[PDB]
């Protein structure tokens, strides 16, 4: 399973596969790993499936209230919420979340949280378990500050490699684009990158 | 370790050895294992050093406190059945005990009780406790007499520990004697095993595994 997020000039573009294997039998193959936790701050889930979803519901409860009392959260804020649930039940709740989002004041930001629960800011992130095959590809051909067209190909091309080398990554490539223009979903079916 | 007491018609001779260990080596040989609970009750330390030393001193808190409330010094039986109840809470918490509370009262005579880790409470009139309890029994039980003298009962005590000291690896050091009368315990001195061994052998013409 491969999850990623990349920062670019107009904001941040998120990227996921859709295969969730358990064992040898693929339970679901159209999984939507890209979750809205506010309305301009979306996340990416990887790892132990029930334990990531449980946390996400609680983070959603935290941010819906945060909005209603104190004002709109930031990428920073949301990631922090996430960390402190993984950190304080860090023996039994096993979660890798990439919190990506578009602020109207600081633009796109990416945070990566691995399984211990430590935040780290990054200009693109990769976490998962199918992202150990594309580590060297993602760093060499990535550029900070790419225009829009470029970004969408960068994340496609990586996931295409992830699909190829990792059999726990597959199906549709889902991308959610977070920008000031708004919130736009793109979907790329297999022939469209298996062509390359 | 080897600790014993036996009633006879003068009261109770309590005798213990004074060497203890940890590992396969002599940690101490200065240790006294006869813990005064009261000045009318003697208790013995065998098994775990800490646990026996701690509780038997706490029993003497509850003995002292008994005297004040009822205006009357406690029975031997009442002392043992405080300790048994307490201990039994700490069962399956790793707590090892292995004590006898011995007292002379005027309404029970000499009495010995054995208390256990498990929380058994047994009465009886010869009780030998320790890793060397097998070797104390022998000599005690072959020359036990109820109708026995006070000179002779301290020497029967002396000798049950000196066999035990000899054959058991972990006993040794010194032998302690106590004659428990009605008016509290009298201490009947300290006999180093080093010095004691060869005097008993010269007197009785016993010991003849051991060169001489």
């Amino acid at each position: 399973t491969s999850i990623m997020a990349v920062t670019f000039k107009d904001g941040v573009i998120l990227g996921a596969d859709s295969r969730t294997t358990t064992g040898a039998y693929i339970a679901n193959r159209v999984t939507d790993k890209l979750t809205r936790v506010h309305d301009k701050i979306w996340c990416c889930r990887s790892g132990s499936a029930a334990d990531t979803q449980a946390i996400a519901d609680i983070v959603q409860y935290h941010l819906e209230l945060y909005t209603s009392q104190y004002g709109t959260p930031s990428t920073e804020t949301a990631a922090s919420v996430f960390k402190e649930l993984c950190y304080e039940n860090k023996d039994n709740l096993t979660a890798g979340i990439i919190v990506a989002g578009y602020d109207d004041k600081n633009k796109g930001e990416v945070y990566t949280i691995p399984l211990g629960g430590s935040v780290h800011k990054l200009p693109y992130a990769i976490a998962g378990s199918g992202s150990t095959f594309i580590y060297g590809y993602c760093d060499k051909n990535f550029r900070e500050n790419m225009s829009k067209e470029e970004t969408v190909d960068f994340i496609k091309h990586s996931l295409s490699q992830a699909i190829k080398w990792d059999g726990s990554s597959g199906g549709v490539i889902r991308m959610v684009v977070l920008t000031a223009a708004g919130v736009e979903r793109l979907i790329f079916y297999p022939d469209e990158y298996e062509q390359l | 370790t080897t600790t014993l007491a036996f009633r006879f018609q003068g009261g109770i001779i309590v005798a213990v050895d004074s060497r203890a260990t940890a590992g396969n080596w002599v940690a101490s040989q200065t240790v006294k294992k006869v813990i005064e609970i009261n000045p009318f009750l003697l208790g013995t330390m065998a098994g775990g050093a800490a646990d026996c030393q701690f509780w038997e001193t706490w029993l003497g808190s509850q003995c002292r406190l008994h005297e004040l409330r009822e205006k009357e010094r406690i029975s031997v039986a009442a002392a043992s059945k405080i300790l048994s109840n307490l201990v039994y809470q700490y069962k399956g918490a790793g707590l090892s005990m292995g004590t006898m509370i011995c007292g002379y009262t005027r309404k029970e005579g000499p009495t010995i009780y054995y208390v256990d880790s498990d929380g058994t409470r047994l009465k009886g009139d010869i009780f030998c406790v320790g890793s060397g309890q097998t070797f104390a029994y022998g000599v005690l039980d072959s020359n036990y007499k109820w109708d026995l003298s006070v000179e002779d009962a301290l020497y029967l005590g002396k000798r049950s520990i000196l066999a035990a000291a000899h054959r058991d690896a972990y006993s040794g050091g010194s032998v302690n004697l106590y004659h428990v009368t009605e008016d509290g315990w009298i201490y009947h001195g300290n006999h180093d095993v080093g010095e004691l061994f060869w005097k008993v052998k010269e007197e009785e013409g016993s010991f003849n595994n051991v060169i001489g």
Binding site: - | A22, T30, K32, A50, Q53, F54, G94
Partner: protein, 222 residues
């Protein structure tokens, strides 16, 4: 997993004098084959003429020493600046040990000073409590090298007169504090050679009724 106790080595030797007390211990501080520090005490003054050393595993050593120096303070506060005996210090220490008996302390603790006869005492404890008044006793790693030697020279153990041939025991010796100090450094010089957990610095707290003296002397550093 987690493992919750270690060992930080070193050794102590408490010698109860006849009118003095001495409490010595090496100050070598180690973990595994590493030498953490050349010098870092294992003998602490607690004041009110009682010295204390807990040697074994360091982390317990620091905390149980610490919880003793408060039990000193609170005693002065609520019993109104009465003298705290060595004898009353001991009983007190036993509850501190025993308080944790299920996740227990890991240090052999030896105290020394002068009590209410003016005679040297050393009290040594086992890790889950129990204590005994001794004339000499060691604790720590290297303790079984130091002990059978000390028994030889102090208590004259197994030495008989010359020409008697065992019929008479060798007569006891009245000691002075310099006679003893000579003997402490030498027994430690041996242990340092022949064991790897001893060395560097030797720190000797002496208690006399005139105050508590601290005398440092070096060992070999290896």
């Amino acid at each position: 997993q987690f493992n919750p106790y270690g060992d930080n080595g070193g050794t102590i030797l408490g010698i109860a004098g006849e009118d003095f007390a001495v409490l010595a211990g090496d100050t070598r501080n180690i973990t595994d084959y590493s030498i953490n520090s050349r010098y870092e005490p294992k003998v602490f003054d607690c004041g009110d003429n009682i010295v204390m050393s807990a040697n074994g595993f360091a982390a317990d050593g620091d905390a149980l020493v610490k919880r003793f120096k408060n039990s000193v303070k609170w005693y002065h506060f609520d019993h109104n600046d009465k003298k705290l005996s060595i004898n009353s210090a001991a009983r007190n220490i036993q509850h501190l040990l025993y308080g944790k008996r299920f996740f227990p302390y890991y240090v052999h603790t030896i105290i020394a000073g002068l009590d209410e006869d003016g005679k040297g005492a050393v009290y040594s404890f086992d890790p889950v409590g129990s204590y005994e008044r001794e004339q000499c006793r060691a604790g720590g790693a290297a303790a079984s090298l130091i002990m059978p030697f000390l028994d030889n020279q102090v208590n004259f153990k197994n030495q008989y007169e010359p020409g008697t041939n065992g019929k008479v025991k060798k007569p006891l010796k009245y000691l002075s504090v310099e006679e003893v100090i000579k003997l402490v450094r030498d027994s430690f010089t041996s242990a340092t050679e022949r064991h790897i957990q001893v060395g560097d610095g030797l720190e000797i707290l002496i208690v006399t009724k005139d105050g508590v003296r601290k005398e440092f002397y070096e060992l070999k550093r290896d």
